[PDB]
């Protein structure tokens, strides 16, 4: 089938967050499922300067009053469509921020334009190619279904995926008369949101189907705690809301071939992980022994529950375990971690900063990874852990709740357990999860069993793509 994907960013061309990763991986992965995807992206300078032999295939005479050429090319493995609209995208730096660090006051118009261009493509303006449906990502592209709904042409199906529910494209009502929309589009069925204009809300109301990056996060956004004000709008359309876990690049993250760790291994050869365990203790300059080695690889923030992790160091040490932390974030948390390490020489190591290679080595040598997040749309670290045989100990939140099979009595009896989940996300709950993990560590047969099961988990983008393709099929009915 033919799908028009719409986004303000895409890896490897331009990226400011995970949004670009999903947008850049899913298309490629989807091909293995009989789906062709062409992703419409803005013609940022950086974007134009990486492509080769763009081929002007269309020319928009009026995009909210500006001209734009539609370029088509093939970059790394993406079938692209670049909206070359100098008036909107030919600027110094940052896709959304100006050289000073503030959003271009011009954003609403720059991305509504992207969306209108996509809706027109959805209407069949391009000779030779007309999508079967549109897949819009985040607010910058959420207006696509809005424009198609109000356009004269009957709309094709659309899937709007939420990556960052905190960025809603909320603007003053004074931009409405510049959006080329009918007056009734500013009603409740449309883009009005508390007397203001909301691009994301608009899209949430008009897309044929809605989705976010994990089944649990899709439930969480229906509640005031995670909805950020759109829970009402989303709840009213729950019947067409879906959750699909993100995949990971299993070729880059493969213990058997990874060049960034000390010694390779697979489920059929765990013995070698011990060599990575040694390397990890040495790197962090802590004792190197057979005790439980726990790690944390994350943003050091309240949202990731690191305030809880900080108060759980003594628990780990008292149980006889060690802890190594790699990450950056809130200065107070960075500081409390370094301070906890300062009174636990030889048992706790903390590295404040960024270090992709060390991150790989940690998944390869640590016995377990603790991820006490309060907020996690999907999560990547638990997937790498499963892949590397590092037992994930996680909070039941968002994707962490959907990706780990808790070692309860029933899963232990059927040998289906892959890790430890704890709920509620409180210090006590975290401490209990930690004690559980230590007990399991001291049961070798069980531990290796969980590692091996974990390592066979299909966490590839191809697996996710399948779920997406399935949804696309139902959408095109």
UniProtKB/Swiss-Prot annotation:
Its EC number is 2.4.1.21. Keywords: Glycogen biosynthesis, Glycosyltransferase, Transferase. GO terms for biological process: glycogen biosynthetic process. Pathway: Glycan biosynthesis; glycogen biosynthesis. It catalyses: [(1->4)-alpha-D-glucosyl](n) + ADP-alpha-D-glucose = [(1->4)-alpha-D-glucosyl](n+1) + ADP + H(+). One of its GO terms (cellular component) is cytosol. GO terms for molecular function: alpha-1,4-glucan glucosyltransferase (ADP-glucose donor) activity; alpha-1,4-glucan glucosyltransferase (UDP-glucose donor) activity. It comes from the Bacteria. Signal peptide: none annotated. ADP-alpha-D-glucose binds at residue 15. InterPro entries: Glyco_trans_1, GS/SS, Starch_synth_cat_dom. The keyword Transferase applies. Pfam families: Glyco_transf_5, Glycos_transf_1. Belongs to the glycosyltransferase 1 family. Bacterial/plant glycogen synthase subfamily. HAMAP family: Glycogen_synth (MF_00484). PANTHER family: ALPHA AMYLASE DOMAIN-CONTAINING PROTEIN, GRANULE-BOUND STARCH SYNTHASE 1, CHLOROPLASTIC/AMYLOPLASTIC. Synthesizes alpha-1,4-glucan chains using ADP-glucose. This is Glycogen synthase 1. The lineage of its organism: Bacteria, Pseudomonadati, Pseudomonadota, Alphaproteobacteria, Hyphomicrobiales.
